[model samples]
Target: STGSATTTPIDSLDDAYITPVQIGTPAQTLNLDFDTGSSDLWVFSSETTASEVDGQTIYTPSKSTTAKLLSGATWSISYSSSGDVYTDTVSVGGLTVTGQAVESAKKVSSSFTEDSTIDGLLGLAFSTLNTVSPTQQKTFFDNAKASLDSPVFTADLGYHAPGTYNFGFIDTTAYTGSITYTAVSTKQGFWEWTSTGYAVGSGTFKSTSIDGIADTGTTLLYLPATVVSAYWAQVSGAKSSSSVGGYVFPCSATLPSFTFGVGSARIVIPGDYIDFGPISTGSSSCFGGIQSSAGIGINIFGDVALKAAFVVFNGATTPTLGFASK
Candidate 1:
């Protein structure tokens, strides 16, 4: 495969409400978001009122064989939709992992309520995107770093199905495929974008001046307005439709093969992803593969584009991104 990489397997379990991590003695489990865009581990607690537990998993302070309170320390997390803030001491298994933070919130949105697969979110990014600052303090990574063999973690994200998020060390020897490394820019912690332009039917690479970031937080591949229009123009079945402050395509015809070039690496966008089903607003069953979000600030290489390759974000070794056979 052109964009493929091998992965080392790590043991992971799915909780009724959260994805639990097995660490330390007695094996304590915490619910986490498993976010790649940001780095932080937080959980809801019994201290949170019943009103806040409406759509989120509430970690019963009483059920935990080992739990600690942060006392006067408090935290609050605000997102695009809802916000959560709380206070709690951090611990793992039977051992107290110092510097564990908690946020107090009275309500959490219901977007992820149906999944109920993980109890809390496990942030795997480099920097903290929360209100409680942990500068010099130990994070989940900091505490677990001592236990890891290589001090590296690997996230093998699966679409819809259960994905693997491994920590406590990385064995490069376990990965046998060719690993392509991209030097990271010092500007930011997220995966930066390099534009090589789009192609149809596996044609020659087209160069465009546009560039953006590849984000796991975003669910869709957001493109520039001009690029989105150009892409839809090439699709035979695409029709224009508006929703959620953006334009969507409605078409019943098959979409042409599309590819995106990131530096020298070309990632293909499958037709199934582009053909976003029939249009509910009109007769066109084919929706424009690319949605136009002109003023959205930055373009996002969402999961639709990420599913094509094995991505690695190396923060420990001078910010770098590595791609291997998936």
Candidate 2:
């Protein structure tokens, strides 16, 4: 059977998008952070040691008539943040993967334990990233791929507001201009693609192959230190803050827009978007949007840069990414 699902971003936070999924026979509903950066469907669960789970929803496999234990095998995962393992019924929209390896947290860090809203995370990355040990597990998308017509999902992350995630189908009317496709290297278990070059404002496009991943779970856009420097140089009165780190400029500074070359096509980010949110109300200092990916060693095109385009994360055999103007 083939089907698709649509998830809307939650209203209250800075694009802390959430959506519903069923976990048991009677179906325990949870609002999951549909993350493209990860590949583990973990939730605060009944098995989680009580002290670690603060106010988040917990998935109790024993409560559902359909939940079954994957005997002997155990699962665990770690990130820059936190969550952990177990296995259970996992479903999204109308599709269901029975006894799927759901990572029910046995231990959750303060990062997840403090957030009262997000109940769990639904990873959309390739199954190769699944962290289950002993017996490797398949993600919902992996298990559901053969049934999909094109093995694709699209993210419409509009600015400052709710966006849509379309699974198994693409809505042509959602974007304008032809979709610019680029091949991805999944060797690292990410939608890592290369940009031929980039430019600051209307200036020249320097030829530099920038390697980066398309991450929905992340909120900022990061690039090489030199690239970030070039962009800020164009803005008058912009100076790198020793305290805040990146260049801080007047809230009214005329900023230069940045563009990335997707082969022959160009994906541009408005200059103002790079300014990010102001440091504080009435404060001249504002955080710069584009930052150096020094520590991480790889650029990450998070929500800020992603909001500029309608993206297609194709899980097809070739794994291509299609970008279009919104």
Candidate 3:
């Protein structure tokens, strides 16, 4: 069986994409960020401190007849998000998985507390990355793969509009041109792949291996410092701001389109997408959607990059990534 869902950006910044998911027998619907960068399906729940939750919806496990606590189980995700574990009937789109491990948050970071748009996060990364102790659990994709028409999922994230996530089978009509395939290294528990090279605007394409993960959870595109520096050099008035902790330029700056090589295919990101948004409301200066990943050990191809094309995450015996022009 195949399933599908719509992914809508929470804000103008495209900070995150939230998809509606159902949990429990009666189906309690909640908007969750389906993150491919991390592996831990956790949500704000009744177990969480009332003070920790703002306007976000909290999952009430007691109300679900299928909800069963996993004794002595605990998990923690990055950003200091920790929770207890429960197995419940979890459904996404039309795909349903019974006894799916659902982490119920007991504590969450202030960053999560500030955002009321997302009720929680559904991790699509490899099960190897799951944080559940004593018994790590598989992701919804993994658990439902057996029943799917095909063991694959595709991400069609848009810049400002709603996109679609399809499971089991690929929508051939969703993309134009053929998809270019590349081997994926899941050793790090991410959809890690290497781009042949990149070009700023229509400039020269420097042939080099750029390794990074296609991270749906992240908002901005982060690449090597050299690559980042090269891209910003073309923009007038662009400068690295210590105060802002990244490259910022006048909102009037004309950003060039960014192109990256996926196999032999080139995916181009429109200049408009690079403008990101003003650092502050009505501020003259704006942040670059593409930033340097020097501090981060590995480069990240986040939504800024993913939004430019259709991405396929193949979960076969030997995992691979497929990219195509939309």
Candidate 4:
């Protein structure tokens, strides 16, 4: 069940901070966020002062022969939580990758900066989120795309286990099913979805009529309050006895399977993710999976649900997400 355990644990520094990927031939470990919501890879630099960045790991170009900092052009980035602003031409593999946009910040305060495990964010989305546009400045993917064997990339999320999220090549052998490509909209760049229906346990979770988008950036699956309650009621081990966030359950119980209708296909969630990693309380440990959010406006199909299948995003032609068999 553990499989190869290639998935690495993305340790959180504080509440949201994550580790960056170690770059170089020897593969140095650096903290980075695997964000699927936005496109644009930004990392901390050695120029960052201790006062400016306390615990975060900044990439020092001096350490690598393939790294170089951009000069003259100033860069800055802001986020919902923390912000990373730095200046330096980007470099990799000892060769200078041209057209790199570097962000320089005087004050850096975000989950990425506070956590020692996380140094920066690797935006995997098709479009850019920061002030700098990919049109004006080339992103890490843009500069490095030519070096890759294939233009396609795959985020092989090990999900709670260690795994390799390889960029470039798409392993057709991993999946036996056909791949479906859905056109992406410029509205937000996130892979949005039009839900056909939802089912919990043996009963219906919500009206099979609602439509929403699927986001991988968020960690947990979020749905409307009414839909959440209906689904929780179906779980045999799910209990509403707790008071903090949402319903809690045991991690070892056989959970009701959730089936999401994506177009003509039905994506199902296995029982293993039902209780998730249930935390211990007083009498017994409650189920960690399937918690409720007050009234989330959007329905998110987070990594937990995404890991069940193979996903490929094609940004070369507008923005589209392709799905295949597991």
lDDT of each: 0.52, 0.79, 0.92, 0.55
lDDT of 3 by residue, 188-269 (tens): 9999999999999989999999999999999989999999999999999999999999999999878899999998889999
> Highest lDDT, which number?
3
Clashes of each: 35, 0, 0, 33
- Number of the top TM-score candidate: 3
Clashing pairs in model 3, backbone N/Cα/C closer than 3 A:
none
* Comparing 2 and 3 on TM-score, the stronger one: 3
Model 4 TM: 0.74
Cα displacement (Å) at residue 157, model 1? 3.0
lDDT of 1 by residue, 70-103 (tens): 4554444443122333323454322234435444
Sort the predicted structures by lDDT, highest score first.
3, 2, 4, 1
lDDT of 4 by residue, 39-95 (tens): 556666666656657666566656655454443444455543222433344433232
Worst 10 residues of 4 by lDDT: 1-10
Q: What would the C-alpha RMSD of candidate 1 be, to one decimal place?
A: 6.2
Alpha-carbon RMSD, each predicted model: 6.2, 2.4, 0.7, 5.4
True-vs-predicted CA distance for residue 177, candidate 1, Å = 5.7
Residue 173 of model 4: what lDDT? 78
Candidate 2 Cα deviation (angstroms), residue 234: 2.2
Return the TM-score for each candidate structure. 0.73, 0.90, 0.99, 0.74
